[PDB]
Amino acid sequence: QVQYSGTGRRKNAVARVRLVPGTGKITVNKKDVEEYIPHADLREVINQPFGVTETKGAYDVIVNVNGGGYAGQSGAIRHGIARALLQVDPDFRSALKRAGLLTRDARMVERKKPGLKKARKASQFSKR
């Protein structure tokens, strides 16, 4: 068969997704969405690229992803899925991009500053 690769990056994480036609499944680090990842209900979050592109499926997922915390690497799965759905059919690009949900969040943790207590927190300063 022909594999459908997909890359995924958000919040100091990295996701390599391999996509395949099937019945609608998800295997992350050889484990299911409720096995490797806890209670979190990101059904609309992860399968929202299946909101308008082949609604609502059903294709099967193999993905190897590490780095960051739990929700941040789950945010990387959107890039692999929607990018791979772009790779399958170009004609779903407009319906995605009118809702967006394809561009990378270019934002991560702020650099500190010496003298301050945090990246923007200043010390408690008496008037005199």
Partner 1 sequence: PRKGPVAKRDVLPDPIYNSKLVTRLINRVMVDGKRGIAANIIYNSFDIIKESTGNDPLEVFEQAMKNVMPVLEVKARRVGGSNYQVPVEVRPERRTTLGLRWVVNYARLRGEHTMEERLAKEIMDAANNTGASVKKREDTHKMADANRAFAHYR
45 binds partner 1 (CB under 8 A): yes
Q: What phi and psi values does residue 52 have, to the nearest 5 degrees?
A: -125, -25
Shortest approach of partner 1 to residue 2 CB, angstroms? 32
44 binds partner 1 (CB under 8 A): yes
Return left, alpha or beta for 115; rule: phi > 0 is left, psi -120 to 50 is alpha, else beta: left
Q: Which does 44 bind (CB under 5 to 8 A by kind): partner 1, RNA, none?
A: partner 1
Q: Which of 1, 41, 103, 127 binds partner 1 (CB under 8 A)?
A: 41
Q: Which residues bind RNA (CB under 7 A)?
A: 3, 5, 7, 9, 11-14, 16, 18, 36, 38-39, 64, 66-73, 93-94, 97, 102-127
Shortest approach of RNA to residue 55 CB, angstroms? 21
Q: What phi and psi values does residue 63 have, to the nearest 5 degrees?
A: -150, 140
110 binds partner 1 (CB under 8 A): no
Q: Which of 14, 42, 62, 88 binds partner 1 (CB under 8 A)?
A: 42
Q: Report cis status (omega within 30 of 0) of the bond before 84.
A: no
- Considering only residues 21 through 40, tell me which ones interact with partner 1, judged by CB under 8 A: 39-40
